[PDB]
Amino acid sequence: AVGACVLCNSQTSLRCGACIRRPFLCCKCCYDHVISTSHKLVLSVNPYVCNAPGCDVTDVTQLYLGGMSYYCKSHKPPISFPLCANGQVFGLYKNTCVGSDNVTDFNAIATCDWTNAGDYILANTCTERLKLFAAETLKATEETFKLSYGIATVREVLSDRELHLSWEVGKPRPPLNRNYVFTGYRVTKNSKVQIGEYTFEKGAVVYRGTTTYKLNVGDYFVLTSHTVMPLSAPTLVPQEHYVRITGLYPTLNISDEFSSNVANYQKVGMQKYSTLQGPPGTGKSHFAIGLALYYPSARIVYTACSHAAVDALCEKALKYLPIDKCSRIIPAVECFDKFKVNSTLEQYVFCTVNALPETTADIVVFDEISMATNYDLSVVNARLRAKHYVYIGDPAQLPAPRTLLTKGTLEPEYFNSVCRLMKTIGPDMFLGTCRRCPAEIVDTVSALVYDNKLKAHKDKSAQCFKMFYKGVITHDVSSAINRPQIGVVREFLTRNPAWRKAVFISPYNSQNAVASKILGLPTQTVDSSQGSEYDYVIFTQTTETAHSCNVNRFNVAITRAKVGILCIMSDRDLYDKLQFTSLEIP
Amino acid sequence: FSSLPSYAAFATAQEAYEQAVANGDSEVVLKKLKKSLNVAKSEFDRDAAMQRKLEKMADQAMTQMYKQARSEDKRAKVTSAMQTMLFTMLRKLDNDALNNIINNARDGCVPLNIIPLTTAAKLMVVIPDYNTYKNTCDGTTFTYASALWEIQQVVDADSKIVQLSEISMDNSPNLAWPLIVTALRANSAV
Amino acid sequence: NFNVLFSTVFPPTSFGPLVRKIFVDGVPFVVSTGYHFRELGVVHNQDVNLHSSRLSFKELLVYAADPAMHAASGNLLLDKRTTCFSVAALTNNVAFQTVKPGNFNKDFYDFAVSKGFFKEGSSVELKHFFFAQDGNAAISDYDYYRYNLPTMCDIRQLLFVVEVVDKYFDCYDGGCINANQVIVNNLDKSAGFPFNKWGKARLYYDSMSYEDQDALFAYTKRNVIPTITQMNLKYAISAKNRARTVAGVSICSTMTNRQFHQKLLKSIAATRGATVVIGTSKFYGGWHNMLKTVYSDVENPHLMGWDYPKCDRAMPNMLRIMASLVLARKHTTCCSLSHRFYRLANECAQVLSEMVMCGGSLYVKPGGTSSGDATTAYANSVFNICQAVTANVNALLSTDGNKIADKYVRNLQHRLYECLYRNRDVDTDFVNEFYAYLRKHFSMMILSDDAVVCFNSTYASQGLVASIKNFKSVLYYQNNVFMSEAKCWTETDLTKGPHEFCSQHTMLVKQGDDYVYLPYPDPSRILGAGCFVDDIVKTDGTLMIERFVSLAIDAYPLTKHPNQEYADVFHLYLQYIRKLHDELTGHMLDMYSVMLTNDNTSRYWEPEFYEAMYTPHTVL
RNA sequence: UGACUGCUCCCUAGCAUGCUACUACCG
RNA sequence: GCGGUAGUAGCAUGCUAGGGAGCAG
Ligand SMILES: [Zn+2]
Ligand SMILES: [Zn+2]
Ligand SMILES: [Zn+2]
Ligand SMILES: [Zn+2]
């Protein structure tokens, strides 16, 4: 009930009641926020509401203080005193305030119902605590929106890859894939019982989960909305290039995992943070593995953003680093348990930001910056307080599932504070070495966003195919379908024998489900499917609208396949920019 | 107390009236002076009293709310302390012998007086004199409560180590006699 | 009554709390969910939940006061110093606690000696000191519970004595009160174990709001909460060299016992002219009024007083149950029949037979009263009245009825036998008749096991009214103690009051125009309080002059005593007060330059300020 | 390490009531 | 000419709250 206000940092006792997160407001700030905005409720050690029996007023500018309680105009005693006066609300530490002038932007942040692009513009354009508050309230409103959904009434199950499941009345079908996790809890007689961490395929219900339970009666599948804890640390800590390498020990020998990893260490050893600006399959994986043994006496942390993207997080660590030096952190969902759980002392911890064993370090690595918000940066900076760290990830990737915005797409400058921090002043690191890839992605993404700092390592045989087909779009439900995909898969496998074992990018997951039901291709997620790409992939049409195709969803999709990248021109794409081979359908 | 809303009017009227008095005018101006100043002071009176009442009311309200906040902080810290104590004392329950004797009960309920008697790992004995000592814990291992215990340490009333070689009949009057013997369960728990 | 007899066969390790395992967020606990009494049988809790989420504040308070976890997370203990049952040791060391001597006020002693005091052969000498104790004193004093034995009662006679006692307790009102009507004084005292590790009673009375207290109080009408009692040693002046010990009850018991009993307790301590004289003061003519009330209109008056050897260590359990039931009879509208039984069970489990924490170990209390609960003195008064009533009944029923000259008393004895052994239900008319007979021929004044009785003498000689021998026999066969008649007195002259009541003697002096009764203490007690203090800062009189003012207030009536040193005590105190004041003023004017005034300060060394405290006019 | 009640004295702060006094308004 | 009302000062009375001390069971 006592703390610092979000603007003056002065001691206060007043909580605003019309903001969903109940921030701590300074008395002058409270007056400014209650006058210039329809936020007319204030909370103190006791609520600022009329206590007259039978009365109901919840204003602040309307109440009068009398005796010991608070009263209104209709019940003010002869000894009365208005609470809202002198442009300053009545509360503790009223004489030790300083006020602030950043009230209009704070009002806009509070009043912004998160509708248009300017919402995120001003979310990313403010002072530190306002960034924290905006991120917190954005996650709060999105989780309230997703919890405003029904309960999956289930009473029986057909079999594996089949399910009958019913939502509530007046509630629509929730979003489809693992980006919106389905984790429910049924009841037997008196309490809740376990169901399983799952996700649904289509509407036939195949299971893309990782378990199988005796599912039938009284089953409650829900997208579990979690209470959000308040933030402590800022989104980033301002760096300063050291002169002493404190704690860091360049070994006598050279652990030559990679050649340029020496320079890696050379400039990541002095600044309080760094970032691994990695194009797909371009050293985005094991530079930290080399750092593991070149700096073996340094406490090194590894993390990502989702439990799905732990492939390179967990493989080479056990593959080449010593067995004992690794450590595992997993809540107990289904993920790689290759290292040791329940071990506090170790130098190489591998996990996600979901849950860690609270400790501090001096070296951290952090993956998947593209779908990372300032909330995740703040929580990783709070849980881990290190000396240097790297944010693995590239702007030429996919945004976080910000379904909140509908009008304007969220561009690289609006991913998070760090993702534009390396955009304005330049990246901490810039690689130009593709591990295993022909120069198609080189040409494409170097003309688009890589600025041609990486060039042809593998030859361009021009086996990849792009055609003149356009496609037709039709909406049914929150997922759509494509007749010039139900026919187009067959029309494109007519005689070409090379893309029969390709992977299916899924702008619409229901369309991929129908393709699997009819012809059959593996389902490939869009956002959380980096590093899971095979050697051979089809980029399908699947859409023409502003769902996916402005710039930054295909920058990684062009790199899914290595030699045979069938990226047909679907819609208002970057057609007249390069050279691409084509075959005309009969 | 000097910039009240009625202060300007009262002071200006007083100054004008006293200037008129210093002008040496007739008695009518003096009567008007007296009436105006009397009513001016009368109206200043309540404006000087009600404000002083209100300030003290506000100060009392502030003090009460401050003490309420302090009480809430103290409650939070005592709750944290109690939770910590409970979760700390939880970690010594020996959850295999306790489970073994709980499951034998016909409904899950057992007397509290037989839990330390059958699941404890350490035993402490307080001995008044040597005659009682030689009948209870003579030697290095003794039997009590249908179990076998072996001695681990012996101290005296001053908490100083005592070796069993000097607990004899002749040397008895040279010890702080409220001796405390510590033993471990043999073959069972510690 | 039958359970008391039958419980002596079964093993003693099957009595007490019954525990089981519950789960809170997947972790296992051990909590008490019932009790097994020697008298009340098996009792099970009504609201117990095995699986639950994170617990609240009152659940934490309840689980932190249960001895189950403390006993289950401790070492076994076999103690051969005492013969009482032992449970567990909470630490790895045994704590030995000593008692320190007093502090000597040399200036007062020299001043008293320089005025002809403490000469050889004098009738006033010091016999009140601070006695010191060695390490093994607390356990030696706790070992006195071996005098408590299981006692079966004559039920057909107790069921009539209880009716007469209830007739005695009839002019009051009581019931339950809300948490906002509870009056507590001195909230800066201990809260018991284990609550004394975090604060005093203020912390727990502030951290708990009103509906939390109400919910906690309503929780004990369907469940039983066993607690732990801590034993402490006293540091006070006395005349004998044995250690004294009081019991510190837990806060969770006192907090609810107050809400249960405070209305009746406050109603008792506000009535004047009743049998129980708790609340009446002795100043402003109170002593004379009490003495005149107790004399009533008895026909051949004598006075008598008796004594209880080991009153609290030897009182049987059945009489404590009876006292609790008598006190709890005012709840006929606010409480149901199960609520009253559960309140009785909670009281028995908390202050009659529970785990005590002596030194650093847990023991089992066999029985008796734990002096220090919320209802000590009133229960003692009920017990005293019960013993007096049964002594009168035994005196009347054991007389040859063929030699009783009066026929009314013969019919009364016949009806008494019929109502005791030939009637199954209550007969209110005879209860009223016996109560009137007792109040006419046997007058009492009771203050928590201290009593003065004015009785008809010829009736007692003929055997129609209880005597000292009847009290001796009743105590022998119902209290398991022997009452020597060397600690009892008898006074056949009413112009001199009781020989001793509440450690005060009585004298009949002439003040104003009439004659009144005044109390005076033992001079040795006053002088010992003057010369021996606890604290070092009380060996400098100028720092506390208000101690001697109170001590001289207590010692005023000694100036009317025919003996001469007794008045010299009061005069010496007045002269010492004047000397201390002069010392302060001069001693402060000298080094500093502050000048003191003697305005309305000389009242403290003149007798008129003290004479007004014993004259009936009631000031402040 | 300091239990539950009862009574009494001293000091300060607030509230209510009453007595007197000094100005002012009204009839 | 008498009364009413509004402040101000001194004095007395009883409660509530805080602190220091004494006795009794
Ligand atoms: Zn607001
Ligand atoms: Zn502020
Ligand atoms: Zn109102
Ligand atoms: Zn009741």
Coordinates of C-alpha atoms in Angstrom, one line a residue, chain A residues 53-480:
Chain A
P53 CA -25.2 3.5 4.2
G54 CA -27.6 3.0 1.2
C55 CA -25.4 5.4 -0.9
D56 CA -23.4 4.4 -4.0
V57 CA -20.9 6.9 -5.5
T58 CA -17.5 5.9 -6.8
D59 CA -16.1 9.3 -7.9
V60 CA -13.2 11.1 -6.3
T61 CA -14.0 14.7 -7.3
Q62 CA -17.4 14.3 -5.7
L63 CA -16.6 13.1 -2.1
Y64 CA -16.1 15.2 1.0
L65 CA -14.1 14.1 4.1
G66 CA -16.1 14.2 7.4
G67 CA -15.4 12.8 10.8
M68 CA -13.4 9.6 10.0
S69 CA -15.1 8.3 6.9
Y70 CA -15.7 9.7 3.4
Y71 CA -19.0 11.3 2.4
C72 CA -20.7 12.8 -0.6
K73 CA -22.7 16.0 -1.2
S74 CA -25.9 14.2 -0.1
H75 CA -24.4 13.1 3.2
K76 CA -21.6 15.6 4.0
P77 CA -21.7 16.5 7.7
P78 CA -21.5 20.2 8.9
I79 CA -17.7 19.5 9.4
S80 CA -16.8 18.6 5.8
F81 CA -13.7 18.8 3.7
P82 CA -13.4 18.1 -0.1
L83 CA -10.8 15.4 -1.0
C84 CA -10.2 16.8 -4.5
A85 CA -8.9 20.3 -4.0
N86 CA -5.9 22.5 -4.7
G87 CA -5.1 20.3 -7.7
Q88 CA -3.7 17.6 -5.4
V89 CA -5.5 14.5 -4.0
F90 CA -5.5 13.9 -0.2
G91 CA -3.0 11.1 0.8
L92 CA 0.2 10.2 2.6
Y93 CA 3.4 12.1 1.9
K94 CA 1.4 15.0 0.4
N95 CA 4.1 17.5 1.3
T96 CA 7.0 15.7 -0.3
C97 CA 5.9 15.5 -3.9
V98 CA 7.6 17.0 -7.0
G99 CA 5.1 16.3 -9.7
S100 CA 6.0 15.6 -13.4
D101 CA 5.1 16.9 -16.8
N102 CA 5.0 13.5 -18.6
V103 CA 1.3 13.1 -17.9
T104 CA -0.1 13.3 -21.5
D105 CA 1.9 10.3 -22.7
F106 CA 1.1 8.5 -19.5
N107 CA -2.6 9.2 -20.0
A108 CA -2.3 8.0 -23.6
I109 CA -0.6 4.8 -22.5
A110 CA -3.4 4.3 -19.8
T111 CA -6.2 5.2 -22.2
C112 CA -4.9 3.3 -25.2
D113 CA -7.3 0.3 -25.6
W114 CA -4.6 -1.2 -28.0
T115 CA -6.4 -0.8 -31.3
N116 CA -4.1 0.7 -33.9
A117 CA -0.5 1.1 -34.9
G118 CA 0.0 4.3 -32.7
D119 CA -0.7 2.0 -29.7
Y120 CA 2.6 0.2 -30.3
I121 CA 4.3 3.4 -31.6
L122 CA 3.8 5.1 -28.2
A123 CA 4.4 1.8 -26.4
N124 CA 7.9 1.8 -27.8
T125 CA 8.1 5.6 -27.6
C126 CA 8.2 6.5 -23.9
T127 CA 10.5 6.4 -20.8
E128 CA 11.5 3.1 -19.1
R129 CA 8.8 2.5 -16.5
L130 CA 6.2 3.5 -19.1
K131 CA 7.7 0.8 -21.4
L132 CA 7.4 -1.7 -18.6
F133 CA 3.8 -0.6 -17.8
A134 CA 2.8 -0.7 -21.4
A135 CA 4.2 -4.2 -22.0
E136 CA 2.6 -5.5 -18.8
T137 CA -0.8 -4.1 -19.7
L138 CA -0.5 -5.3 -23.2
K139 CA 0.0 -8.9 -22.0
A140 CA -2.8 -8.3 -19.5
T141 CA -5.3 -7.3 -22.1
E142 CA -4.3 -10.1 -24.5
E143 CA -4.6 -12.7 -21.8
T144 CA -7.9 -11.4 -20.7
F145 CA -9.0 -11.5 -24.3
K146 CA -8.0 -15.2 -24.7
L147 CA -9.5 -16.1 -21.3
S148 CA -12.8 -14.6 -22.6
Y149 CA -13.4 -18.0 -24.2
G150 CA -15.5 -21.0 -23.4
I151 CA -14.6 -24.3 -21.8
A152 CA -14.2 -27.4 -24.1
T153 CA -17.0 -29.6 -23.0
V154 CA -15.8 -33.2 -23.6
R155 CA -17.5 -36.4 -22.6
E156 CA -16.0 -39.1 -24.9
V157 CA -13.1 -39.7 -27.3
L158 CA -13.1 -41.7 -30.5
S159 CA -9.4 -42.7 -30.8
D160 CA -6.0 -41.3 -31.5
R161 CA -6.0 -38.5 -34.2
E162 CA -9.7 -38.1 -33.5
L163 CA -11.9 -36.2 -31.0
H164 CA -15.3 -34.8 -30.4
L165 CA -15.0 -31.6 -28.5
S166 CA -17.5 -28.8 -27.9
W167 CA -17.0 -25.1 -27.0
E168 CA -19.5 -23.0 -25.0
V169 CA -22.6 -21.2 -26.4
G170 CA -21.8 -17.8 -27.7
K171 CA -18.0 -18.5 -27.9
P172 CA -16.2 -19.0 -31.2
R173 CA -13.5 -21.5 -32.1
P174 CA -10.2 -20.4 -30.4
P175 CA -6.9 -20.1 -32.4
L176 CA -5.5 -23.3 -33.8
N177 CA -1.9 -24.3 -33.2
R178 CA 0.6 -24.5 -30.4
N179 CA 1.1 -20.8 -30.5
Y180 CA -2.0 -20.8 -28.3
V181 CA -1.4 -23.8 -26.0
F182 CA -4.2 -26.1 -25.0
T183 CA -3.7 -27.2 -21.4
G184 CA -6.8 -28.2 -19.5
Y185 CA -7.9 -29.8 -16.2
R186 CA -10.9 -32.1 -15.6
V187 CA -12.7 -33.0 -12.4
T188 CA -13.6 -36.3 -10.9
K189 CA -15.6 -35.5 -7.7
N190 CA -14.2 -32.7 -5.6
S191 CA -11.1 -31.2 -7.3
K192 CA -9.3 -30.9 -10.6
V193 CA -7.4 -33.7 -12.4
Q194 CA -4.8 -33.8 -15.1
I195 CA -5.6 -33.9 -18.8
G196 CA -2.5 -33.1 -20.8
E197 CA -0.6 -30.5 -22.7
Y198 CA -2.1 -30.6 -26.2
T199 CA -3.0 -28.7 -29.3
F200 CA -5.7 -29.3 -31.9
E201 CA -5.3 -30.0 -35.6
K202 CA -8.6 -29.3 -37.4
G203 CA -12.3 -29.7 -37.2
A204 CA -11.5 -34.8 -37.4
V205 CA -9.2 -33.7 -34.6
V206 CA -5.6 -35.0 -34.9
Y207 CA -3.3 -34.6 -31.9
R208 CA -0.1 -32.6 -32.4
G209 CA 0.7 -32.9 -28.7
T210 CA 3.2 -35.1 -26.8
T211 CA 1.1 -37.4 -24.6
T212 CA -1.9 -39.7 -24.6
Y213 CA -4.4 -39.8 -21.7
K214 CA -7.5 -41.9 -21.0
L215 CA -9.6 -38.9 -22.2
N216 CA -13.4 -39.0 -22.0
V217 CA -15.8 -37.8 -19.3
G218 CA -15.9 -34.3 -17.8
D219 CA -12.8 -33.2 -19.7
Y220 CA -12.1 -29.4 -19.7
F221 CA -9.7 -28.3 -22.4
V222 CA -8.8 -24.6 -21.9
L223 CA -6.1 -22.2 -23.1
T224 CA -4.9 -21.6 -19.6
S225 CA -4.7 -17.8 -18.8
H226 CA -2.0 -17.1 -16.3
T227 CA -1.8 -14.3 -13.8
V228 CA 1.0 -11.8 -14.8
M229 CA 3.6 -10.9 -12.1
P230 CA 4.9 -7.3 -12.0
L231 CA 8.2 -6.5 -13.6
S232 CA 11.4 -5.5 -11.6
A233 CA 14.2 -4.9 -14.1
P234 CA 14.2 -2.7 -17.2
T235 CA 14.1 -4.1 -20.7
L236 CA 17.9 -3.5 -21.2
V237 CA 20.9 -2.3 -19.1
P238 CA 23.0 0.4 -20.7
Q239 CA 26.3 -1.1 -21.7
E240 CA 29.8 0.3 -21.2
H241 CA 32.8 -1.2 -23.0
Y242 CA 35.2 -2.5 -20.3
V243 CA 39.0 -2.3 -20.3
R244 CA 39.6 -5.2 -17.9
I245 CA 38.3 -8.7 -18.8
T246 CA 37.0 -9.3 -15.3
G247 CA 36.3 -13.0 -14.6
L248 CA 36.6 -13.8 -18.3
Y249 CA 39.6 -16.0 -19.1
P250 CA 40.8 -16.5 -22.7
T251 CA 42.6 -19.9 -22.5
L252 CA 46.2 -20.4 -23.3
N253 CA 45.3 -22.6 -26.3
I254 CA 42.6 -21.8 -29.0
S255 CA 39.5 -24.1 -28.8
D256 CA 39.1 -23.7 -32.5
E257 CA 35.4 -24.7 -32.9
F258 CA 35.0 -21.8 -35.3
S259 CA 37.6 -19.5 -36.8
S260 CA 36.0 -16.1 -36.3
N261 CA 34.8 -17.1 -32.8
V262 CA 38.1 -15.5 -31.5
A263 CA 36.8 -12.1 -32.8
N264 CA 33.4 -13.1 -31.3
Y265 CA 35.0 -13.2 -27.9
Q266 CA 37.2 -10.2 -28.7
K267 CA 34.3 -7.8 -28.9
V268 CA 31.7 -9.6 -26.7
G269 CA 34.1 -9.6 -23.7
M270 CA 33.9 -5.9 -23.0
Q271 CA 30.3 -4.6 -23.5
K272 CA 27.5 -5.3 -21.1
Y273 CA 25.5 -7.1 -23.8
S274 CA 25.8 -8.2 -27.4
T275 CA 23.6 -10.0 -30.0
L276 CA 24.1 -12.9 -32.4
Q277 CA 22.8 -11.3 -35.7
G278 CA 22.4 -14.6 -37.5
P279 CA 20.7 -15.4 -40.8
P280 CA 19.3 -18.9 -40.8
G281 CA 22.0 -21.6 -40.8
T282 CA 24.8 -19.0 -40.7
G283 CA 26.5 -19.8 -37.4
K284 CA 23.4 -19.1 -35.4
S285 CA 23.9 -22.3 -33.4
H286 CA 27.4 -23.2 -32.1
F287 CA 29.3 -20.0 -31.8
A288 CA 28.1 -20.1 -28.2
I289 CA 29.3 -23.8 -28.2
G290 CA 32.8 -22.6 -29.1
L291 CA 32.5 -19.8 -26.4
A292 CA 31.7 -22.6 -23.9
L293 CA 35.2 -24.0 -24.1
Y294 CA 37.2 -20.8 -25.0
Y295 CA 35.7 -19.2 -21.9
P296 CA 35.3 -22.4 -19.8
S297 CA 35.8 -20.6 -16.4
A298 CA 32.9 -18.2 -17.1
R299 CA 29.3 -18.8 -15.9
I300 CA 27.4 -19.1 -19.1
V301 CA 23.6 -19.1 -19.5
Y302 CA 21.5 -20.3 -22.4
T303 CA 17.9 -19.5 -23.1
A304 CA 15.2 -19.1 -25.8
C305 CA 11.7 -17.8 -26.0
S306 CA 9.6 -21.0 -26.6
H307 CA 9.9 -24.6 -25.6
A308 CA 9.6 -25.6 -29.2
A309 CA 12.9 -23.9 -30.4
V310 CA 15.3 -25.8 -28.1
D311 CA 16.8 -27.9 -31.0
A312 CA 20.2 -26.2 -31.2
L313 CA 19.8 -25.2 -27.6
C314 CA 20.1 -28.8 -26.5
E315 CA 21.8 -30.8 -29.3
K316 CA 25.4 -29.7 -29.7
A317 CA 25.7 -28.9 -25.9
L318 CA 25.6 -32.6 -25.1
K319 CA 27.1 -33.6 -28.5
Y320 CA 30.5 -31.9 -28.0
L321 CA 30.7 -30.1 -24.6
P322 CA 31.6 -32.3 -21.6
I323 CA 28.7 -34.2 -20.0
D324 CA 28.9 -32.8 -16.5
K325 CA 29.3 -29.1 -17.5
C326 CA 25.7 -29.0 -18.9
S327 CA 22.6 -28.7 -16.8
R328 CA 18.8 -29.0 -17.5
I329 CA 15.9 -26.9 -16.3
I330 CA 12.4 -28.2 -17.1
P331 CA 9.1 -27.6 -15.3
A332 CA 7.3 -30.7 -14.2
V333 CA 6.3 -29.4 -20.2
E334 CA 7.4 -32.0 -22.8
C335 CA 10.8 -31.0 -24.0
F336 CA 14.5 -32.1 -24.1
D337 CA 15.6 -33.5 -20.7
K338 CA 19.0 -34.4 -22.0
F339 CA 21.0 -32.8 -19.2
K340 CA 20.6 -33.0 -15.4
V341 CA 17.6 -31.4 -13.6
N342 CA 17.8 -30.3 -10.0
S343 CA 21.4 -29.0 -10.0
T344 CA 22.1 -25.5 -8.9
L345 CA 25.9 -25.5 -9.3
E346 CA 26.9 -25.6 -13.0
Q347 CA 28.4 -23.4 -15.7
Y348 CA 26.1 -24.2 -18.6
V349 CA 22.4 -24.0 -18.0
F350 CA 20.0 -24.6 -20.9
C351 CA 16.3 -23.7 -20.6
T352 CA 13.6 -21.2 -21.6
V353 CA 12.5 -18.0 -19.8
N354 CA 9.5 -19.9 -18.4
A355 CA 11.1 -20.9 -15.1
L356 CA 14.7 -20.9 -13.9
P357 CA 16.5 -21.5 -10.6
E358 CA 17.1 -17.9 -9.4
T359 CA 20.8 -17.1 -9.6
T360 CA 23.1 -14.5 -11.2
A361 CA 25.8 -15.0 -13.8
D362 CA 28.3 -13.1 -15.9
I363 CA 27.6 -14.6 -19.4
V364 CA 24.2 -15.4 -20.9
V365 CA 23.0 -16.3 -24.4
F366 CA 19.4 -15.5 -25.4
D367 CA 17.7 -16.9 -28.6
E368 CA 14.8 -15.8 -30.8
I369 CA 14.8 -12.0 -30.5
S370 CA 12.3 -11.6 -33.3
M371 CA 9.3 -12.9 -31.3
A372 CA 10.6 -11.4 -28.1
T373 CA 8.8 -8.5 -26.4
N374 CA 10.2 -6.0 -23.8
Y375 CA 8.5 -8.0 -21.1
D376 CA 10.6 -11.1 -21.9
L377 CA 13.8 -8.9 -22.0
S378 CA 12.9 -7.4 -18.6
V379 CA 12.2 -10.9 -17.1
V380 CA 15.5 -12.3 -18.4
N381 CA 17.3 -9.2 -17.1
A382 CA 15.6 -9.6 -13.7
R383 CA 16.0 -13.4 -13.2
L384 CA 19.6 -13.2 -14.6
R385 CA 21.8 -10.2 -13.8
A386 CA 25.0 -10.9 -15.8
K387 CA 28.0 -8.9 -17.0
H388 CA 27.7 -9.7 -20.8
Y389 CA 25.1 -11.5 -22.8
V390 CA 24.1 -12.0 -26.5
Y391 CA 20.6 -12.0 -28.0
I392 CA 20.6 -14.6 -30.7
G393 CA 18.1 -13.6 -33.5
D394 CA 17.7 -11.5 -36.6
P395 CA 15.2 -8.8 -37.7
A396 CA 14.7 -10.8 -40.9
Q397 CA 12.4 -13.1 -39.1
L398 CA 8.8 -13.4 -37.8
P399 CA 7.1 -11.2 -35.1
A400 CA 5.5 -12.5 -31.9
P401 CA 1.9 -13.6 -32.2
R402 CA 0.6 -10.0 -31.8
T403 CA -3.0 -10.8 -33.0
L404 CA -4.0 -7.6 -31.1
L405 CA -3.0 -5.4 -34.0
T406 CA -5.2 -5.7 -37.1
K407 CA -4.7 -2.6 -39.2
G408 CA -0.9 -2.1 -39.5
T409 CA 1.8 -4.7 -39.5
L410 CA 4.4 -4.6 -36.8
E411 CA 7.7 -3.9 -38.6
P412 CA 11.4 -4.5 -37.5
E413 CA 11.5 -1.1 -35.8
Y414 CA 8.6 -2.2 -33.5
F415 CA 9.6 -5.7 -32.4
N416 CA 11.1 -4.6 -29.1
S417 CA 13.5 -2.0 -27.6
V418 CA 16.7 -4.0 -28.4
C419 CA 15.5 -5.0 -31.9
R420 CA 15.5 -1.4 -32.9
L421 CA 18.5 -0.6 -30.6
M422 CA 20.6 -2.6 -33.1
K423 CA 18.6 -1.1 -35.9
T424 CA 19.4 2.6 -35.2
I425 CA 23.0 2.5 -34.0
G426 CA 23.8 -0.8 -35.8
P427 CA 24.1 -4.4 -34.7
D428 CA 26.6 -5.6 -32.1
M429 CA 27.6 -8.3 -34.5
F430 CA 27.1 -9.0 -38.2
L431 CA 28.0 -12.4 -39.8
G432 CA 28.3 -13.1 -43.5
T433 CA 29.1 -16.9 -43.5
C434 CA 26.2 -19.2 -44.5
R435 CA 27.0 -22.7 -43.2
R436 CA 25.3 -24.8 -45.9
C437 CA 23.1 -22.9 -48.4
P438 CA 23.2 -22.0 -52.1
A439 CA 23.2 -18.3 -53.0
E440 CA 19.4 -17.9 -53.6
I441 CA 18.8 -16.7 -50.1
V442 CA 22.0 -14.7 -50.4
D443 CA 20.7 -12.8 -53.4
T444 CA 17.1 -12.4 -52.2
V445 CA 17.6 -11.4 -48.5
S446 CA 20.8 -9.4 -49.3
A447 CA 18.9 -7.3 -51.9
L448 CA 16.1 -7.0 -49.4
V449 CA 17.5 -6.5 -45.9
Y450 CA 20.9 -8.1 -45.5
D451 CA 22.6 -5.3 -47.5
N452 CA 24.8 -7.9 -49.3
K453 CA 27.3 -8.4 -46.5
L454 CA 27.1 -12.1 -47.2
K455 CA 27.7 -13.5 -50.7
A456 CA 27.8 -16.8 -52.6
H457 CA 29.3 -19.6 -50.6
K458 CA 27.5 -22.5 -52.4
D459 CA 26.9 -22.3 -56.2
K460 CA 23.5 -21.3 -57.7
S461 CA 22.3 -24.1 -60.0
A462 CA 18.9 -22.5 -60.3
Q463 CA 16.9 -25.7 -59.6
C464 CA 14.5 -23.7 -57.4
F465 CA 11.2 -22.9 -59.1
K466 CA 8.8 -19.9 -59.0
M467 CA 5.8 -19.8 -61.3
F468 CA 3.2 -17.3 -62.6
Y469 CA 0.3 -18.7 -60.6
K470 CA -1.7 -16.3 -58.5
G471 CA -4.4 -18.1 -56.6
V472 CA -7.9 -17.2 -55.2
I473 CA -8.7 -16.6 -51.5
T474 CA -11.9 -17.3 -49.6
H475 CA -12.8 -16.8 -45.9
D476 CA -14.9 -19.2 -43.9
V477 CA -13.9 -18.9 -40.3
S478 CA -10.9 -17.5 -38.4
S479 CA -9.0 -19.9 -40.7
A480 CA -9.5 -19.9 -44.5

